[PDB]
Each structure stands twice: as C-alpha cells, then as structure tokens.
Amino acid sequence: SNAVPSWKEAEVQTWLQQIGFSKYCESFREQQVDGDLLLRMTEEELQTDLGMKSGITRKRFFRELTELKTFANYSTCDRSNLADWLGSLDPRFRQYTYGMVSCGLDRSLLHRVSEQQMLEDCGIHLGVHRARILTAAREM
Amino acid sequence: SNAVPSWKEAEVQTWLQQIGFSKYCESFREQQVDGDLLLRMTEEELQTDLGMKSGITRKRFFRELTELKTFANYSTCDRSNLADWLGSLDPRFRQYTYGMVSCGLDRSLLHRVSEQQMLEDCGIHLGVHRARILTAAREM
Amino acid sequence: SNAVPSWKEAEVQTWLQQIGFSKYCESFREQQVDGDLLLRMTEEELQTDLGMKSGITRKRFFRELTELKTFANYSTCDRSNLADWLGSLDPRFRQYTYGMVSCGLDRSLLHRVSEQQMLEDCGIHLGVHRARILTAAREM
Amino acid sequence: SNAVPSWKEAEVQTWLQQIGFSKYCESFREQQVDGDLLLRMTEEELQTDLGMKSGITRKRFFRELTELKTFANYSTCDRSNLADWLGSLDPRFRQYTYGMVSCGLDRSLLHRVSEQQMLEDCGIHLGVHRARILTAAREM
Amino acid sequence: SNAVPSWKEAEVQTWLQQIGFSKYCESFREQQVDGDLLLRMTEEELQTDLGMKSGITRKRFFRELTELKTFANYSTCDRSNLADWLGSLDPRFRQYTYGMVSCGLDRSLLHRVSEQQMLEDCGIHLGVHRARILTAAREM
Amino acid sequence: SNAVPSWKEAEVQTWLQQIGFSKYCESFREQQVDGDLLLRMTEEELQTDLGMKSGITRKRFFRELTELKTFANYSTCDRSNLADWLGSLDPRFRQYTYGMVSCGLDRSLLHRVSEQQMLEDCGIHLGVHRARILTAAREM
Amino acid sequence: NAVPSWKEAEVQTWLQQIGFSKYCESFREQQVDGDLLLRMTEEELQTDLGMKSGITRKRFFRELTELKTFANYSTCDRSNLADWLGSLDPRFRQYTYGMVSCGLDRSLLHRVSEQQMLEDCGIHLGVHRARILTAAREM
Amino acid sequence: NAVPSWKEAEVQTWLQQIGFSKYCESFREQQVDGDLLLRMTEEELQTDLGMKSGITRKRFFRELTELKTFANYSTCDRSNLADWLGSLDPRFRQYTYGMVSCGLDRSLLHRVSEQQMLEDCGIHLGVHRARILTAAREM
Structure with missing residues (x-):
C-alpha cells in the first residue's frame, strides 16, 4: 500500500518491520499510531511517548520517514x-x-x-x- | 444531538465512547466535563487534570475534537x-x-x-x- | 440576598451550596472568604489556598463566579x-x-x-x- | 491611640487583636514590628518572615492595613x-x-x-x- | 564616639548593644566587623555572612544604621x-x-x-x- | 573504500579501529552508525548516545573525522x-x-x-x- | 616592595603582616605568588582558597587595594x-x-x-x- | 621546540619541566599531544584533566602562554x-x-x-x- 495518509495501525506496524524497527512495534500500537500520526511525528513524541531514547536512533527514524514521505501518494488529501x-x-x-x-x-x-x-x-x-x-x- | 455548546455530561460521555476513548470516561465524569468545557479543552487540562499523559493520545484526542468543533451546531450562541x-x-x-x-x-x-x-x-x-x-x- | 459586595461568610457558604461546590465549603470557611474576597478571587488563590487542584474545577468555578458577578447588585460601591x-x-x-x-x-x-x-x-x-x-x- | 507612625510593639499587638489576627501576634513580637515597620509592610515579609502562608489571609491583612493607613494620624511626621x-x-x-x-x-x-x-x-x-x-x- | 570610619571592633560591638542587637554581637566579632565595614554593609552580607535571616530584622538594622550614618563625623576622610x-x-x-x-x-x-x-x-x-x-x- | 556516504556499519567499525578508537566500537554498533550518520555526527550525539564523555577525546575524534571528510569520495552523492x-x-x-x-x-x-x-x-x-x-x- | 616580582615567601609574609595567618597554608598549597595575588578575583578567594565569608573577602580586598596602590611597578x-x-x-x-x-x-x-x-x-x-x-x- | 609537532612524550616532558608532574597521568590517559595542548580550554582542564583549582589552572595557562609565545610555527x-x-x-x-x-x-x-x-x-x-x-x- 502507498496511500500513507490512509494507513491504519496495521499498515504502520508492517512498515516498522521493513525498516528494521521491530523494537518499537508494540510501542506504536499501544499509542495507536496510524498514517496521519506517523506523517506528523515530532522529535519530542518519539523520545517521550514512544521510548526512542537515542538521538542517533531518532535520526535514523527520520531518515526512513523522510524516504516514506517523499514517495507517498497524497491524492486523497x-x-x-x-x-x-x-x-x-x-x-x-x-x-x-x-x-x-x-x-x-x-x-x-x-x-x-x-x-x-x-x-x-x-x-x-x-x-x-x-x-x-x-x-x-x-x-x- | 448536535448542539455541542448545550451538551451535558451524558452527551460528552457518549461521544467519548463513540471515538474509542471509553478508557477516559470516568475521568471526564469526575471532572464534570460538559459541552462548554469540552469545546474549550486545552492540552494542559488533558495531561494534568484528565490523566492523558501521552502526547500522541492527546493529538488523537484533538483530532477528534477538531472534527467535532467543525461540524457542530452553534445556533444557540x-x-x-x-x-x-x-x-x-x-x-x-x-x-x-x-x-x-x-x-x-x-x-x-x-x-x-x-x-x-x-x-x-x-x-x-x-x-x-x-x-x-x-x-x-x-x-x- | 444579591448585594455580593456586602456578603459575609454565611452568604458565600450558601452560594457555594447552590452551585454544587459544597465540597469546598470548609476551605472557604477556614480562609474566611466573604463577598469582597470572592469578587477578587484569583486562580492562584483557588489552587494554592483553597485546595482546588483541578484546573477544570477552577474553570467551572469561574464560570459560576462570572454568572454571580454579572447579575450582582453594586449599588453600595x-x-x-x-x-x-x-x-x-x-x-x-x-x-x-x-x-x-x-x-x-x-x-x-x-x-x-x-x-x-x-x-x-x-x-x-x-x-x-x-x-x-x-x-x-x-x-x- | 491613632498615631501609627509613633506606635511601639505594644500598640501593634493591640491592633492585631482588634482585627482578629491574634494567631500572628507572637510572630509580630519576636520580629519586633512597630508602627514604622507595619506601615512599610510588604507581602514578601508577611509570607516569609511572619509565617503568613495563605495569600487569601494576606489579602485580608492588607485590607485592614489599608483602612488603618487611610485614617491614620500623621501629625508626627x-x-x-x-x-x-x-x-x-x-x-x-x-x-x-x-x-x-x-x-x-x-x-x-x-x-x-x-x-x-x-x-x-x-x-x-x-x-x-x-x-x-x-x-x-x-x-x- | 561619633567618628564611625575610625571605629574598630570594640566600638561596633558597643553600638550593637545600644540598639538592642546583642543577639548578633558574636557574629559581628567573629567576622571582625569594624567601622568601615559597618558603613558599607549590604543586605547580602547581613543575610549570608552574619546570619540575619529575617528581612524585617534587616530592615530594622538598616533603620538604625541610617540613623548612625546621618549623624557621623566624616572629618577624617x-x-x-x-x-x-x-x-x-x-x-x-x-x-x-x-x-x-x-x-x-x-x-x-x-x-x-x-x-x-x-x-x-x-x-x-x-x-x-x-x-x-x-x-x-x-x-x- | 573511501566513499564514506555509501559506508555501511562494517566500514565504520573498520575505520574506528584504524584511528585507535576500538574502545567505542560496541557503542557505534549498537547505535547502528553508518557513513551518513558518521558524516553528520554532532558533539551532543557523541557525548550522550555513544558514551564519549571526555571533551578531549571528542576533540581527538573530530580531528580524525575532519581528516576523513576532507579526503572522502563524494562521487556517489x-x-x-x-x-x-x-x-x-x-x-x-x-x-x-x-x-x-x-x-x-x-x-x-x-x-x-x-x-x-x-x-x-x-x-x-x-x-x-x-x-x-x-x-x-x-x-x- | 616589587609585588609583581614577589614569590610565594613574600605572599606568606604579607598575609601574616595583615592578620590573615589563618589562610597562610591555603595560599601556600595553591602556590600564590605576586602575579596571582595582584590578579586575585572574588571567585578564586571563595572557591579555591576557602574564604567563604564575603565580609572576610571585603577585608582582604581592602588590604589588597592598599598593597596595589603603593607597589613598585618599575619592573613591568x-x-x-x-x-x-x-x-x-x-x-x-x-x-x-x-x-x-x-x-x-x-x-x-x-x-x-x-x-x-x-x-x-x-x-x-x-x-x-x-x-x-x-x-x-x-x- | 616545534610544539605543533609534539607527540605525547614531549607534552609529558614539558609538564615535568614546569612543575606540573602531578598532572602527568591525566595528560597521558587523555592522550594530549601538541595540537591539543595548544588548543587547551579552561573547561577541558577542569572537567577532563581534573585540574579543580582555578588558581592552578591560571598557573597552567601562565606557563602555556610562555610555551605558545616562543614556539616554532614553521611547520604550519x-x-x-x-x-x-x-x-x-x-x-x-x-x-x-x-x-x-x-x-x-x-x-x-x-x-x-x-x-x-x-x-x-x-x-x-x-x-x-x-x-x-x-x-x-x-x-
């Protein structure tokens, strides 16, 4: 699937595994992160609410998130x-x-x-x- | 009903369940949140007074609250x-x-x-x- | 009575009961809140000196206090x-x-x-x- | 006696009794508050040095002090x-x-x-x- | 004696006794306060180095120190x-x-x-x- | 290989050994530092996330990293x-x-x-x- | 009298001559000579030399100002x-x-x-x- | 004499000649060479090299200023x-x-x-x- 804005929690969970972030799968589900929240993810939310402590790990995340944002289909909005x-x-x-x-x-x-x-x-x-x-x- | 400014506690409790926030039902009732307070909800009140610690959960809440504010009936005021x-x-x-x-x-x-x-x-x-x-x- | 500026402690205690704030009657009694103090009530005094921890409870209080201040008789001052x-x-x-x-x-x-x-x-x-x-x- | 600027500690103790502030008599005694200090009293001194923690009680105090300052005898200074x-x-x-x-x-x-x-x-x-x-x- | 700038510790100790500040005699002596230091006394030095915690007591002290500074003999400087x-x-x-x-x-x-x-x-x-x-x- | 932008974690680990920083190999691996992160490394990331506490050790690191950045292969980007x-x-x-x-x-x-x-x-x-x-x- | 040229011994003697013998060894372990004495700051007195009292520090700078006023600076x-x-x-x-x-x-x-x-x-x-x-x- | 080209051995010798042998092991564990010595900051001395006393640091920078003044900079x-x-x-x-x-x-x-x-x-x-x-x- 490519319409990230329309992603539900399941689609986000799959994306975390394909980018090697299985460590944070359960965190994103208890926080109920979907496509809209993933696209608006902030540095503070990763650190405080999702438990991503390392700033280097956060920089890797935004590296992958920028790649997802670049090739997403935004026609629905x-x-x-x-x-x-x-x-x-x-x-x-x-x-x-x-x-x-x-x-x-x-x-x-x-x-x-x-x-x-x-x-x-x-x-x-x-x-x-x-x-x-x-x-x-x-x-x- | 649709006239959110006129909502009593019961209408807020029903709305919280329809958006999947039953987890926070009793908190909104002990604080006696009605329509006027719900429409004036601040981020600090959610975190401090209603126990909604996660900033991601708060962003989900304001997502639902913004849609409610968008299609509410304001004729009475x-x-x-x-x-x-x-x-x-x-x-x-x-x-x-x-x-x-x-x-x-x-x-x-x-x-x-x-x-x-x-x-x-x-x-x-x-x-x-x-x-x-x-x-x-x-x-x- | 309606001349709030002339209210003594008894009239403040009665008003708290009529607005459903009997929970804070005893606090308003030890602090000796009369009409003059009630009309000059600040948010910091409610939180610190009267024990009204919840910001939502304080916002409800000022809702009732604004109703009292709006329709009060100010002839005496x-x-x-x-x-x-x-x-x-x-x-x-x-x-x-x-x-x-x-x-x-x-x-x-x-x-x-x-x-x-x-x-x-x-x-x-x-x-x-x-x-x-x-x-x-x-x-x- | 009404000439507050000339008041010694004894006159201040009497005035505290006349306004119902006997609770703070001994504090005013060890701090050796006379008329000059009473007329120059600040809220910080009430809170820190005289033990008057409640902001509402301090507002009551300045209510009485302002009436005393308004009708005081200033012939001596x-x-x-x-x-x-x-x-x-x-x-x-x-x-x-x-x-x-x-x-x-x-x-x-x-x-x-x-x-x-x-x-x-x-x-x-x-x-x-x-x-x-x-x-x-x-x-x- | 009135030439305060030439005062040594003995003259300062005597002055503290005549103004009712015997409680702080030892502090002024261990700190070796003489006339020059007394005339240049600051609020920070009273509180931190001489143990005068009460702001009201400090206000009384500067009341007496101002009286001393007013009637001092400055011929020597x-x-x-x-x-x-x-x-x-x-x-x-x-x-x-x-x-x-x-x-x-x-x-x-x-x-x-x-x-x-x-x-x-x-x-x-x-x-x-x-x-x-x-x-x-x-x-x- | 000199093309640092294309470096994987293995190439970064090899570089740490050639500069005498084997002490920090395990930190750089658990954080999954590759060439892109190494070229964008900040002093705060070294101190907080990689455990390089000494500011002198950090200055030695940036000395070697600046040498790497100066003579790097940038054909790929x-x-x-x-x-x-x-x-x-x-x-x-x-x-x-x-x-x-x-x-x-x-x-x-x-x-x-x-x-x-x-x-x-x-x-x-x-x-x-x-x-x-x-x-x-x-x-x- | 050439304070800029003072070694540690002259500082130790001067501390005794102004009644600051209590702080002699402190100035010795810190190796205070004339150059350091002339450049003394309030933070160095409090933190590094143990002169907690601000009143004692004011007495020190009173004596140090007198020393700085009548020193011989010909050598520099x-x-x-x-x-x-x-x-x-x-x-x-x-x-x-x-x-x-x-x-x-x-x-x-x-x-x-x-x-x-x-x-x-x-x-x-x-x-x-x-x-x-x-x-x-x-x- | 070419301080910019100094390795750790030359820094250790210089610390001994200026009476700072007490800090030899610190400068060795931190691997201070000529380049780092010339770029020494007060924060690095205090935190990373253990030079707690501000007066001791002022004495150090006094000697470091002497070294920086008379160094041979031909190599850079x-x-x-x-x-x-x-x-x-x-x-x-x-x-x-x-x-x-x-x-x-x-x-x-x-x-x-x-x-x-x-x-x-x-x-x-x-x-x-x-x-x-x-x-x-x-x-």
Missing part, C-alpha cells in the same frame, strides 16, 4: 496537486506535502506563505529549503 | 452566524467558532481583531490560519 | 453606575465592575484608562474585552 | 500635610502618605515625582492611582 | 565637606557621605555623576533621592 | 562536484561537502546561501570559514 | 602608567597591573573603551572608569 | 603569521596556532572581524582584538 509542485522544484521537497496540506495550504495560497509559517506550522526545518520554496512561490 | 463566515472562507475554520463567540466576537467586530487577540483569546494556534482570517476580515 | 454602562456595551462586561470600582474608577475617569491598566489593575484578562471597552471609553 | 492633599484628591489615596513621607516627599516636591518612582520608592502599586496622582501633581 | 553639601540639600542625604567618598567623589566631581553611578557605586537605592541629588549637582 | 569547488578555494573547506549536499545545495545554488544557513543547516561552525565561502560564492 | 610598567593614574587620583594606582597585564601603556590609553576597562582591566567601579576615560581622551 | 605557518603578531606585541604571538588552525594568514587578516577573533581564534582579551584589528587594517 492534496486536491491542488501541491506534491508535484514541490517535486518539480526539487525531489526532496515532496516530503513537506502533508505538512502544508494539514494546515490548509494549496497552490492558490503559496504566495501568501511566510518563512516563519513554513517553520512553525508546516514543519520545514531546513532554512535552505524554506528559502527556495519561498522564492519559488513569489515568482508565480 | 452564534447569533451573527460567525460559523458560516469562517466556513465560507475554509471549512476547517469553523472549529474556531466557539472560541471567537466565547470572547464576544461577531461579524461586526471582525475587522477590529488583531492576530495577538486571535492567538491569546480565541485560540487560533496555526499562524497560517490567523493570517488568512485577518486578510478576509479586512476585505469587508 | 458603584456610585456612577459603572455596571450598567459596561453591561449595556456587552453582557459579558458587567463582571468587571468590582475590579474597576475597587481601584477607584468611574464613568468620569474611563477615558483616562489605558489597556495595560485594565490588565494589571482591573483584572480584564481578555484582550478583545480591553480593546472594546477602551474604544467605547473614547466615544464619550 | 507629615510636615507638609501631604495626607490631606492626597485625601482631597481621592479618599483612597490617603493610604500612600507614609510611603511618600518616608522617602522625603512633600507638597513642594510632588511635581518632580515620576510614576516609576511612585512604584519603586513609594509603594503605589495600582497604575490607575499613579496616573491620577501624577496628573494632579502637574496641574498645580 | 571627607576633604570637600561633602556631608554638609548633602545635608544642606536634605538632612537625611547625609547618610550617603561615606558611600560617595569611598569611590573618590567630592564636590568638584559631583556635576559629572550619573544616576546609574549613584545606584551601583554609591549605594543610593531610593530613586527620588537620586533625582534630587542629580538636580542639585547640575545647578552648581 | 555530489552531483555538481561541490567538493572540488570547495577544495579549490581552500583544502580545509572540502570537509563541508556532505553537509551542503545533505540539504541539497550545489554549485548553481551557492550564490543564494546565507551565512545563517551555513551555520544552522550545513554545520560550518567556524565564522571565518563561512565568511570566505560566502565571498567566493558571490564573485561568480 | 615601562610607560610609567602608574604615575599617570596617580596624578589623576592616588587610589587609581591600584589598576596599574591590570592594565599592564593586557598590554596597555600611555600610547594606547586614548584607544581604550569602557567595556575594555571593565572586562579586561578589572576597573569595577563605574565612577572610576568614567574618570579614567575622560582623562585619557583629553591628551 | 607558511605566511609567518607568528612573527607578524610578535612584532606587534610579544604576548600576541600565542594566538598564532588559533588563527592558523582556521586557515588564516597575512593575506586574510584584513578581512577578519573582531567577533571572529573571539569565537574562532580564541583571543579572549578585548584590548588584544582591538589592537590586532587596527594593525591588520593599516596594511
């Missing part, structure tokens, strides 16, 4: 095809699709987005990424 | 139909109805509201949402 | 009838009467009050409320 | 009759007499006093009160 | 008769003589002294006092 | 040959290749990079280095 | 910075070693900022910094 | 930055390794800011930063 707009700018920018869609952004609104909003609301932590997406949104 | 003004801007903006109505806002007053008031007093935490409501309130 | 001026502007504003009257405000002085003074001295915590009262004070 | 100048402006302003006389203010010097000085040096905590005293002092 | 310059402005300003003389000030230098220097270096904590001394220094 | 651009500017600058490539920079994008981005996102901690790279990017 | 003050400070005010001579230690001289005085005098030279009294600044600029 | 300073700093003021030669480590030379000095000398080169004295900056601009 991305009406303006925001994913392929980010992808046409740079392939690694497709990971930010669900973050921008969760706070109600689309192609029509990109020119009104500020860099702080991309940080606080969309979860775009890399400044170089914010700078290129911000600039590309202005030249439309 | 929103006389200026502020809900449909928010809804016509974006369906997900309807959740902020009770927050704005609780601090005495209506359509007549929207153009005089600042973003700090929307953050501190109305509870609109997403910056993109505050910016969009501000712009629409000014075009009148 | 409000010489300029500031209560009905606030009330005619918005029903929710009549609760702030005792706070403004305690620091010596009246209709004659309202136009000289700043928004910070309303927060620090009168206890108007909602920014939208301060903004509306300030504007109305200037239109006279 | 108020050389410019600053008390009757404050009182003629507003009866509630007479409480600030000793705080202003202790740092050497008089009628001659009032126009040179800033609002920051009234807070830090004179102990006028209410902002609305500081603003009214400033305005009246400059219009002389 | 005040070449410009700075004491009588302060005294002619206001009698209680004479207490600040040793503080200003210790940092090398005199009448010749008064006109370039700033309000921060009077606070940090001379120990004039009352703002109203600093404002009048500043004004007098510029009118020379 | 450096599409614009950014390493040889940095190297032609100064040999010590080649260490920053993976940091810039990890956030997707290339020769085409260098002129749009700010000094804050080189610090927060690329990991160029030396200010003199950031200043020289920024200047060279502008002269193109 | 080539521009006679001590007598420049002294002509401005006798008590300003104590700051000589602090200013000489960070490489200052008369040639450099007009280029010194007040923050440099606070952080680097150790002139903590603001009134003193203001007076030295004014005199350094009028040259 | 091709622009002879050491003798440029030294000719400006003898105490400035210690900053050679700190500046050479971040790739600076005479050609680059005029582009260095005062903040860079603090954060990157380790020139903690403000008066020193001000003097080097001014001299670097007159070239």
Whole structure:
C-alpha cells in the first residue's frame, strides 16, 4: 500500500518491520499510531511517548520517514496537486506535502506563505529549503 | 444531538465512547466535563487534570475534537452566524467558532481583531490560519 | 440576598451550596472568604489556598463566579453606575465592575484608562474585552 | 491611640487583636514590628518572615492595613500635610502618605515625582492611582 | 564616639548593644566587623555572612544604621565637606557621605555623576533621592 | 573504500579501529552508525548516545573525522562536484561537502546561501570559514 | 616592595603582616605568588582558597587595594602608567597591573573603551572608569 | 621546540619541566599531544584533566602562554603569521596556532572581524582584538 495518509495501525506496524524497527512495534500500537500520526511525528513524541531514547536512533527514524514521505501518494488529501509542485522544484521537497496540506495550504495560497509559517506550522526545518520554496512561490 | 455548546455530561460521555476513548470516561465524569468545557479543552487540562499523559493520545484526542468543533451546531450562541463566515472562507475554520463567540466576537467586530487577540483569546494556534482570517476580515 | 459586595461568610457558604461546590465549603470557611474576597478571587488563590487542584474545577468555578458577578447588585460601591454602562456595551462586561470600582474608577475617569491598566489593575484578562471597552471609553 | 507612625510593639499587638489576627501576634513580637515597620509592610515579609502562608489571609491583612493607613494620624511626621492633599484628591489615596513621607516627599516636591518612582520608592502599586496622582501633581 | 570610619571592633560591638542587637554581637566579632565595614554593609552580607535571616530584622538594622550614618563625623576622610553639601540639600542625604567618598567623589566631581553611578557605586537605592541629588549637582 | 556516504556499519567499525578508537566500537554498533550518520555526527550525539564523555577525546575524534571528510569520495552523492569547488578555494573547506549536499545545495545554488544557513543547516561552525565561502560564492 | 616580582615567601609574609595567618597554608598549597595575588578575583578567594565569608573577602580586598596602590611597578610598567593614574587620583594606582597585564601603556590609553576597562582591566567601579576615560581622551 | 609537532612524550616532558608532574597521568590517559595542548580550554582542564583549582589552572595557562609565545610555527605557518603578531606585541604571538588552525594568514587578516577573533581564534582579551584589528587594517 502507498496511500500513507490512509494507513491504519496495521499498515504502520508492517512498515516498522521493513525498516528494521521491530523494537518499537508494540510501542506504536499501544499509542495507536496510524498514517496521519506517523506523517506528523515530532522529535519530542518519539523520545517521550514512544521510548526512542537515542538521538542517533531518532535520526535514523527520520531518515526512513523522510524516504516514506517523499514517495507517498497524497491524492486523497492534496486536491491542488501541491506534491508535484514541490517535486518539480526539487525531489526532496515532496516530503513537506502533508505538512502544508494539514494546515490548509494549496497552490492558490503559496504566495501568501511566510518563512516563519513554513517553520512553525508546516514543519520545514531546513532554512535552505524554506528559502527556495519561498522564492519559488513569489515568482508565480 | 448536535448542539455541542448545550451538551451535558451524558452527551460528552457518549461521544467519548463513540471515538474509542471509553478508557477516559470516568475521568471526564469526575471532572464534570460538559459541552462548554469540552469545546474549550486545552492540552494542559488533558495531561494534568484528565490523566492523558501521552502526547500522541492527546493529538488523537484533538483530532477528534477538531472534527467535532467543525461540524457542530452553534445556533444557540452564534447569533451573527460567525460559523458560516469562517466556513465560507475554509471549512476547517469553523472549529474556531466557539472560541471567537466565547470572547464576544461577531461579524461586526471582525475587522477590529488583531492576530495577538486571535492567538491569546480565541485560540487560533496555526499562524497560517490567523493570517488568512485577518486578510478576509479586512476585505469587508 | 444579591448585594455580593456586602456578603459575609454565611452568604458565600450558601452560594457555594447552590452551585454544587459544597465540597469546598470548609476551605472557604477556614480562609474566611466573604463577598469582597470572592469578587477578587484569583486562580492562584483557588489552587494554592483553597485546595482546588483541578484546573477544570477552577474553570467551572469561574464560570459560576462570572454568572454571580454579572447579575450582582453594586449599588453600595458603584456610585456612577459603572455596571450598567459596561453591561449595556456587552453582557459579558458587567463582571468587571468590582475590579474597576475597587481601584477607584468611574464613568468620569474611563477615558483616562489605558489597556495595560485594565490588565494589571482591573483584572480584564481578555484582550478583545480591553480593546472594546477602551474604544467605547473614547466615544464619550 | 491613632498615631501609627509613633506606635511601639505594644500598640501593634493591640491592633492585631482588634482585627482578629491574634494567631500572628507572637510572630509580630519576636520580629519586633512597630508602627514604622507595619506601615512599610510588604507581602514578601508577611509570607516569609511572619509565617503568613495563605495569600487569601494576606489579602485580608492588607485590607485592614489599608483602612488603618487611610485614617491614620500623621501629625508626627507629615510636615507638609501631604495626607490631606492626597485625601482631597481621592479618599483612597490617603493610604500612600507614609510611603511618600518616608522617602522625603512633600507638597513642594510632588511635581518632580515620576510614576516609576511612585512604584519603586513609594509603594503605589495600582497604575490607575499613579496616573491620577501624577496628573494632579502637574496641574498645580 | 561619633567618628564611625575610625571605629574598630570594640566600638561596633558597643553600638550593637545600644540598639538592642546583642543577639548578633558574636557574629559581628567573629567576622571582625569594624567601622568601615559597618558603613558599607549590604543586605547580602547581613543575610549570608552574619546570619540575619529575617528581612524585617534587616530592615530594622538598616533603620538604625541610617540613623548612625546621618549623624557621623566624616572629618577624617571627607576633604570637600561633602556631608554638609548633602545635608544642606536634605538632612537625611547625609547618610550617603561615606558611600560617595569611598569611590573618590567630592564636590568638584559631583556635576559629572550619573544616576546609574549613584545606584551601583554609591549605594543610593531610593530613586527620588537620586533625582534630587542629580538636580542639585547640575545647578552648581 | 573511501566513499564514506555509501559506508555501511562494517566500514565504520573498520575505520574506528584504524584511528585507535576500538574502545567505542560496541557503542557505534549498537547505535547502528553508518557513513551518513558518521558524516553528520554532532558533539551532543557523541557525548550522550555513544558514551564519549571526555571533551578531549571528542576533540581527538573530530580531528580524525575532519581528516576523513576532507579526503572522502563524494562521487556517489555530489552531483555538481561541490567538493572540488570547495577544495579549490581552500583544502580545509572540502570537509563541508556532505553537509551542503545533505540539504541539497550545489554549485548553481551557492550564490543564494546565507551565512545563517551555513551555520544552522550545513554545520560550518567556524565564522571565518563561512565568511570566505560566502565571498567566493558571490564573485561568480 | 616589587609585588609583581614577589614569590610565594613574600605572599606568606604579607598575609601574616595583615592578620590573615589563618589562610597562610591555603595560599601556600595553591602556590600564590605576586602575579596571582595582584590578579586575585572574588571567585578564586571563595572557591579555591576557602574564604567563604564575603565580609572576610571585603577585608582582604581592602588590604589588597592598599598593597596595589603603593607597589613598585618599575619592573613591568615601562610607560610609567602608574604615575599617570596617580596624578589623576592616588587610589587609581591600584589598576596599574591590570592594565599592564593586557598590554596597555600611555600610547594606547586614548584607544581604550569602557567595556575594555571593565572586562579586561578589572576597573569595577563605574565612577572610576568614567574618570579614567575622560582623562585619557583629553591628551 | 616545534610544539605543533609534539607527540605525547614531549607534552609529558614539558609538564615535568614546569612543575606540573602531578598532572602527568591525566595528560597521558587523555592522550594530549601538541595540537591539543595548544588548543587547551579552561573547561577541558577542569572537567577532563581534573585540574579543580582555578588558581592552578591560571598557573597552567601562565606557563602555556610562555610555551605558545616562543614556539616554532614553521611547520604550519607558511605566511609567518607568528612573527607578524610578535612584532606587534610579544604576548600576541600565542594566538598564532588559533588563527592558523582556521586557515588564516597575512593575506586574510584584513578581512577578519573582531567577533571572529573571539569565537574562532580564541583571543579572549578585548584590548588584544582591538589592537590586532587596527594593525591588520593599516596594511
């Protein structure tokens, strides 16, 4: 299955095993992590609520989570095809699709987005990424 | 029933079971949570006063609470139909109805509201949402 | 009786019973809470000095206290009838009467009050409320 | 006797009995509180040094102390009759007499006093009160 | 004796007895407090090094120390008769003589002294006092 | 093999032995450190997650890691040959290749990079280095 | 009298001459000589030398300030910075070693900022910094 | 004499010649060589080498400043930055390794800011930063 936003708990459990994170399978089930929560996973939630203590292990997790976000199918929630707009700018920018869609952004609104909003609301932590997406949104 | 602002404890208890939160039923009853308190629920009250320690569980709770706020009937307290003004801007903006109505806002007053008031007093935490409501309130 | 500013401990004890807060009768008795102290009640005093640990219980209390402050008779201390001026502007504003009257405000002085003074001295915590009262004070 | 500035420890003990604060008599005795210290009392001293833990009890104490300060005899230390100048402006302003006389203010010097000085040096905590005293002092 | 700057431990021990502070005699003796240290006594030194925990007791101490500083003989260290310059402005300003003389000030230098220097270096904590001394220094 | 970006855990373990850090082999294996994590290693990760407590030992580690980063094989991930651009500017600058490539920079994008981005996102901690790279990017 | 040239023995003798024999061995185990004595900080007294009492520390700096004021700095003050400070005010001579230690001289005085005098030279009294600044600029 | 090229043996010998034999085993267990010795910070001495006393650390940096001042930097300073700093003021030669480590030379000095000398080169004295900056601009 590829529609990560529509994933239930079972689909997340399978993904943890294919990425070598069987250690955290039961934790993700007692917390009832589904696709929506997995795509919005934060550094604090991994450490405190899921028991992922090592910062290096967390960095491995976000490495795999970024890979999943990059090749996910967002058609069921991305009406303006925001994913392929980010992808046409740079392939690694497709990971930010669900973050921008969760706070109600689309192609029509990109020119009104500020860099702080991309940080606080969309979860775009890399400044170089914010700078290129911000600039590309202005030249439309 | 659908008029959440008018909900008594029984309606909150039924709603908690329909969303799979029976585990927290007695906590919501000992605290005597009704519709007004449920609509004004903060993250600290869930953690401290209702025993919902997991931040992931809280995010699931606010996921269900945001959907309830979005499709609730506010006729008994929103006389200026502020809900449909928010809804016509974006369906997900309807959740902020009770927050704005609780601090005495209506359509007549929207153009005089600042973003700090929307953050501190109305509870609109997403910056993109505050910016969009501000712009629409000014075009009148 | 209804003149809360003139209430002694007996009237406060009766009011707690009528709002279902008999559980906190004994606490309000050892602290000797009368009408003046009840009208100037703060959240910190409820938590620390009266033993109201739950923030949800405190929010219910201020819900009832706001109802009492809104429909109280302030004739014994409000010489300029500031209560009905606030009330005619918005029903929710009549609760702030005792706070403004305690620091010596009246209709004659309202136009000289700043928004910070309303927060620090009168206890108007909602920014939208301060903004509306300030504007109305200037239109006279 | 009413000349609080000239009070020794005996007169303070009598006053504590007249306001129902016999519980704190011995604390005021070992700390050797006289009239000068009573008129300059701060909340931190009540809490830490006199053992008055309850914030509600402290608010009751300052209620009695403010009435004592308002109707006190300042003949022995108020050389410019600053008390009757404050009182003629507003009866509630007479409480600030000793705080202003202790740092050497008089009628001659009032126009040179800033609002920051009234807070830090004179102990006028209410902002609305500081603003009214400033305005009246400059219009002389 | 009145020339406090020349006091050794014996004169300080006697002064503590005449003001009713015999309880702290031993502390002042083991710490070897003489006249110079007594005139430069700070609140931190009383609390930490001399065991004066009560803030009310410290306020009583500085009440007596201010009385001693006011009527002291500064002939042995005040070449410009700075004491009588302060005294002619206001009698209680004479207490600040040793503080200003210790940092090398005199009448010749008064006109370039700033309000921060009077606070940090001379120990004039009352703002109203600093404002009048500043004004007098510029009118020379 | 010199292509550190493609290194697996086995290649990292071999490198630790060649630099005399066999003591930390087990830590690097339980944390599953590969080439990508090794090139992005931070001082906080060494101390907290890998047990390298001594700051002097950590400084020795970064000495060896900087040597590895300087002469590494970037053919598998450096599409614009950014390493040889940095190297032609100064040999010590080649260490920053993976940091810039990890956030997707290339020769085409260098002129749009700010000094804050080189610090927060690329990991160029030396200010003199950031200043020289920024200047060279502008002269193109 | 050449405090900058003092070895540990001279510091031990001076501690006895000012009534601080109680702290003699502490200054000995820490190997305090003239250079360290002239650069003594309050944190070093409390933590490393065991002088817990802040009042005792104030007595120490009272005696140390007298020593700094009348010391002979000829062996390290080539521009006679001590007598420049002294002509401005006798008590300003104590700051000589602090200013000489960070490489200052008369040639450099007009280029010194007040923050440099606070952080680097150790002139903590603001009134003193203001007076030295004014005199350094009028040259 | 070439401190940048010193291995652990030379550091152990230097500690003995300065009377710091007490800390020989610490410098050996931490494997301190010439490069680490020249980049020694106060935090590393206190936490990692066990030098608890702040006075002992000040004595150490006193000797380390002597070593840094008279070291031979030919093996890493091709622009002879050491003798440029030294000719400006003898105490400035210690900053050679700190500046050479971040790739600076005479050609680059005029582009260095005062903040860079603090954060990157380790020139903690403000008066020193001000003097080097001014001299670097007159070239």
